[PDB]
Amino acid sequence: TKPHVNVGTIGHVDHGKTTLTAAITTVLAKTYGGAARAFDQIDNAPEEKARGITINTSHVEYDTPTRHYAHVDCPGHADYVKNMITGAAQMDGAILVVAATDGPMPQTREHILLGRQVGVPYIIVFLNKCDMVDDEELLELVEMEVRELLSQYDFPGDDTPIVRGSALKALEGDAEWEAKILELAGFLDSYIPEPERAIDKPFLLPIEDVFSISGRGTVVTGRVERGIIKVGEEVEIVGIKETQKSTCTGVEMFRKLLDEGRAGENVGVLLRGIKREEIERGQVLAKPGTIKPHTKFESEVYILSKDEGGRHTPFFKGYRPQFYFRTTDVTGTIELPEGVEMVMPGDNIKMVVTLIHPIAMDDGLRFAIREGGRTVGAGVVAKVL
Ligand SMILES: Nc1nc2c(ncn2[C@@H]2O[C@H](COP(=O)(O)OP(=O)(O)O)[C@@H](O)[C@H]2O)c(=O)[nH]1
Ligand SMILES: CCCn1nnnc1NC(=O)c1cccc(Cl)c1
Ligand SMILES: [Mg+2]
């Protein structure tokens, strides 16, 4: 029906993220329709687990006239680290809450940095607790600080919408402040562009399996992540070895022959001129020249704690774990940031990885870190090298 957008509140503890979330649901419900949620519901964050990693996360939903929002909110800075690196949803945009009284604080900076590292494309600022501040000059100063901070991490500080509001007053029914929640909603609508639907993006299919079908040749199977592959189209085979070219000479689903395969569908793609031996675990079919193989990259990683089922001991420079991208492990070596000799269970670090075989990747690609099958960490490619 409507574009689905992933958003969430970020910023320092006690600046009013949870209150703002409650106020957004409430104000949009009574204006546009929906179900209002209350501070104490959202504040009481349920614990969720995905492959060992425990995160206290609250999920709410709200609607504007044109868009539907899945909105994430977390109690602790520890959860934001985990959620941003390894969480289910990747954010299309974040709302940075900064309390007008305090101004920018350490976690304000950390979340902006993390935002950049994990590829959070857009940030909008809600300048909160403006009911506690009457001197307009001070609001301007706090705003300028935030704009500066955002620019430091390559966000367009000068151009980022900043809304002067009060989450509490708006949650309590003050129409004058509820108007500011609506201004924020407008910026979500207007400033975060409509998310590209997978079908519209360049074709990509991670290869899960391979067969030689009698009287046709080599078929590669998987789910179409993005785009459309049609019979006759050229495709590249990227990863593990030098990229290969071929033509799609068929798309099968179960027993039905199709002229194309679309994002979301599990299909078998027949490849002209390609042997079964020329297909390796970890490769993707891609629209020619739309995704490149890389061996070395910069990453933000979270290392599982003892409790989460991770390592007991810490690792050092000479650590060579399995890096799980899409379908398969690939061994790699690491380089740690200056003045770091060690990494403990539960730490998160910037980490430069060098893979032994290349993998098709762009910035934003998620991965797990494994030791003989068992997940010991998780991460996201921050910059390809
Ligand atoms: N005066 C005022 N207080 C607020 C506002 N928003 C939140 N608070 C208060 O700040 C405290 C922390 O808010 P909370 O939403 O829990 O912050 P979080 O730690 O970022 O989730 C609570 O006592 C709120 O009532 C506001 O706009 N004005
Ligand atoms: C949870 C699975 C990994 N795991 N779990 N418990 N310990 C480990 N890893 C190691 O012991 C280890 C052994 C030799 C060298 C190094 Cl660098 C690390
Ligand atoms: Mg909170």
Numbering used by the authors: 8 to 392
What does the study report here?
EF-Tu is an essential and universally conserved GTPase that is critical for protein synthesis. EF-Tu delivers aminoacyl-tRNAs (aa-tRNA) to the ribosomal aminoacyl (A) site during the elongation step of translation. During trans-translation, EF-Tu delivers alanyl-tmRNA-SmpB to the empty ribosomal A site. Domains 2 (amino acids 209–299) and 3 (amino acids 301–393) together bind aa-tRNA; domain 3 also interacts with EF-Ts to promote nucleotide exchange.
To determine the binding site of KKL-55, we solved a 2.2-Å X-ray crystal structure of EF-Tu co-crystallized with KKL-55. EF-Tu crystallized in the spacegroup P1 with two molecules per asymmetric unit. In our structure, KKL-55 binds EF-Tu domain 3 in a pocket formed by residues Gly317, Arg318, His319, and Glu378. Arg318 is at the bottom of the binding pocket and packs against KKL-55 from the tetrazole to the benzylchloride, with the positively charged guanidino group oriented toward the electronegative arene ring. Gly317 and His319 form one side of the binding pocket, and Glu378 forms electrostatic interactions with the tetrazole ring of KKL-55 on the other side of the pocket. These EF-Tu residues are broadly conserved, suggesting that KKL-55 is likely to bind EF-Tu from many bacterial species. The propyl group on KKL-55 extends out of the binding pocket, consistent with the observation that large substitutions at this position do not compromise activity. Binding of KKL-55 results in the reorientation of Glu378 and compensating movement of the peptide backbone of residues 379 and 380 away from the pocket. The R318A mutant had drastically lower affinity for KKL-55 (K d >30 µM), with a K d 15-fold higher than wild-type EF-Tu, consistent with the location of Arg318 in the KKL-55 binding pocket. Binding of KKL-55 to this site dramatically decreases the affinity of EF-Tu for tmRNA.
